Amino acid sequence: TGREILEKLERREFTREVLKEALSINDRGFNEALFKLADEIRRKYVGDEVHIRAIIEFSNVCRKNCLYCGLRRDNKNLKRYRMTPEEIVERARLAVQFGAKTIVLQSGEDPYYMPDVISDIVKEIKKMGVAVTLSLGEWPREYYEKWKEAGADRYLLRHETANPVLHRKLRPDTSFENRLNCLLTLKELGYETGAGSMVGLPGQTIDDLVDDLLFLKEHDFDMVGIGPFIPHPDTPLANEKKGDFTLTLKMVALTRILLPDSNIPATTAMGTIVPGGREITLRCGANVIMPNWTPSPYRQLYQLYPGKICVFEKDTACIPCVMKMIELLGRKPGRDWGGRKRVFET
Template sequence: MSAQSLPLWFDVATIEKALSRRNVPDAVELRDILDKSMQMEPLDLNEIVALMRVDDPAGHERILAVADEVKQKVYGDRMVLSAPLHLSNHCGSECLYCSNRRDNGLVERKYMTSPEMRQAALKIIRQGHKRIFLVSGQLPNADVDYLAEAISILYTVFDGVGEIHSVNVNVGPLEAAQYQTLLDAYVGTVLIYQDTYHEASYRAAHVAGPKSDYVKRLNAPDTAFAAGVPDVGLGILLGLGPWQFDLLALAQHATHLERVYDLGCRTVSLHRMRLAPGSLMDTPYPVSDADYLRCVALARLALPHSGIILTTKEPAGLWRDGCSAGASQLLTGSVANPYEGWALAPGQQVPFPLGEDCHVDEVVRFLLEEARHLPSFCAACPRLGRRGEEFLAMVRECGMKGQCSPNSAASFMEFLLHYATPYTRSMGERLLNEKLNKMSLHERGAADRLLKKVRAGCMDEFI
């Protein structure tokens, strides 16, 4: 039992009771649960656990297919691409699994300078990106002014064709005034990852520093919403705690936020634990590929209106399958993975990464060849100031799909014309024509009008 009081919304006993179920749902129960999902109704904890207990391949595939269909209803057949940007690895927390941990002497510590931020932003833009996720270590007194400055700088970088239109920030718990500083810089989504809701696992991994405060972390999204932040994203680090417990707790958390603030969580990030230089912890609860896909699908069914974010850190075949299991966004390109590929030399510090991890053209080509999804670089919502309640209202009414499809087609054509390799452009135009032929009459008309403008040299066209 925690020495601090857990928030009232966090009902561990109810989670454990739900997880005590061991029997497999029969055909009627499975049908009823999936039919409920198709009506865009969030699943309760008992229904989520029932789907966890499905153990036959046909039933598992059916769950993945319904999750993809729910995603299609909400967002259409597109995959939004964003680039992570690691600003700093200075950190005041000792999290045993993390390369940025305070006492790790293996890595070189660095803050990106303003010129380096501009250089990194240009690399990202020149791949075709319009969206960035900022990542940094967490100091005892979070350097919010540094983050706000980075946001402002990134919005001013222009490569002659493209620019950044949305900057999201991954931060720890802040005070109300600090959130306002980020809002004044026009931050996108504020990402506050619990990593694991399982208290024993959390405390075993986060042993010192600001991130060791388990309860403060649980309460951080409430503080952000109360401070006026319109869009908050949640996330779990799969493998740090039991994924089944974490998924139910995440659903509880999102339900609480929607009930109290009528906003819920804008996004849910699902990343698996990975070995990092100087890590002192192996993965306590390894998550298989099959369970990873099951978790992605169940997150979509539990939270039908949230954006589900995956990363190309996962093996190519796995994130591809995840894109067809309910995911709607993909992190890729730029300095997407600051750990993998770093050379470990005895007595030598691992340098802070400033180059690209993988080029987005490769990811787009893979999506076109294998997954057959429409890559999207659309930034219409941030351009229109569509946030919070306005954004969620459109998603709930499935009105986002009618705009996402044409806008995604236009943003993808911009990428093909200005940033894609010739081979990717040829493939992309063929797939785009296929997608256009499958759109509704209204969507096709809007898409054709936007594409005509893009082909005439216009940029950032949207409805």
Template sequence: MICTSHSFQPVDFSEKQIIELLNGTQDPWLFDQAKLVSQQVFNNQVFIRGIVEFSNNCRHNCHYCGLRSSNRKVERYRLSTTEILDAVDEVALLGIETVVLQSGDDWQYRAETIAELIRTIKDRHNLAITLSLGDRKHQELKLWREAGADRYLLKMETFNRRLFRQCRPNANFDERLTRLSYIQSLGYQTGSGVITDLPGMSDEILANDILKLSSMGLDMLACGPFVAHSQTPFAQHSNGSVLKSHRVSAILRLLNPGAHIPATSSLDVIEPGARELALIRGCNVVMPSFTPAHVYARYNIYPGKNSATCQMQQRIALIFKKIQHHGLKPNPSRGDSKRNQYVPRC
């Protein structure tokens, strides 16, 4: 765990001020302040998490996602527990102390199967385990926490009820929001996030999303630009703005000095080098994929996702080099939340 003597109070932005910042009125100040806060709170460190995307099956039919249930062009896969554990072993072998287990909303994996997977990982390695498995039942979330899972990521994509309904047909807004609170109550280090420039999203909606996200006391905050996928109802919409996504991560940093904010791969899909740039604009986490090579490219939530062709060790070395290029220090340790009451303090 990394502790620091630096302390920053959250900035108190109004909705109007956030909208002005989203429009680029103070970019030099915004990015400079976000860089200062992020680097001093986290001692110039960027935390590395290894992600294993073990299934691209999903029961939801979100209009922005390539894995949507009605997309018949997806070559579906499910990894066995042995394949998942082999991938986790690779994460641990490279000295990375956090593994993120991610899938679509795939209920074919029984709750006890996931629980046993968590226990086995904990027996084998001293790793923090983040789950990103979508909408699951309360008893399942409780079981996995008791089995040893440390963190849970459940993105809302937007906190605007109307836009949520347009983007996520048949998903229940209130249930998902309630589930987020329940996850927090279980002691998970909890994360959520939004997609910037979703079709139908205004700056007013995005500003309110930022304020809502920041009011929840979350440990992890995610934001990334919308990327159009040809096999979705949003195929004809333009990709989101990288610059606006950077503004959002910077604003979130100033509102939430101690939260972990990942630089997402969607940034690089739209503009090569944009994920690296996000690390000096408020972000402090990078999550390279350790999904096995034979299914790596099939986790295609947006075009260009998991498109790297070099070997994993080369990928990690390149990520480290890019981080160090900016005077930052890649840190593969657990990097637990500074905000969560269940995490032991220094």
């Protein structure tokens, strides 16, 4: 029964059997109770602060060919861009002037910057007294070491799917084994490390989602980024179905329940598939948001998926907008860098 599954989640009996049933039950009452549980666990462990991570998507050049992604190298219907290191540093400075306590640098897997230009950029931003999070994909250990020495604090590297067969199909340049080895190296080097997956990929099952949750629990990641798959018209997956918002929201809720002290963003993909999706997600376990800080005229060219919200807004709009969002949600802005605050338990 739904009531029995909630009782087991409340007692932290996180068996495969319990997680599968939670994801399989579609009862509105059960779902609402699950979201309430996750919301309460979030409030108890990580409080009411919503941590703002200002994201600068500094290049849409990519060497990889992921089947879901609009930046895949085979996509010729996309104007490619690269911000200069001076542009990136000064754009980061502007975010810090607007109150950002974490700068996130994200790109396609663009060889041009790697590793030294990134190191130089990271060193300049670290002078501003903020946390730096990188999201640059898969690189050699030596690059990750150099970036950590340069001052990088965190690394976001979504594991995408924990099914190694699906992973290899969707990401033909690499493997789940590679992705996991990247994540383990990041952890070893002392990064606060973020993983997470997409929900509703072509061929992905409920059992795969259960494996995603068990994988996250196993490795105790500091951050978990979860969003729905959104098909992009300039990719091989163009005609496939979008991920379901409510199922994806259940994955966020379960992630909070399993990893109560983790940092969990309300992802832009959630706000893209449903108007107000990020706000809902912030009320179902999430405690982080990433306002878009990519400048014009490049913001519109960073199209991992279509319809992406905030593309049409003035450059500087998203930090003020999320501060208003945080207030109308009855939440507080983060006071410090919002690093993980571990609660050791049993």
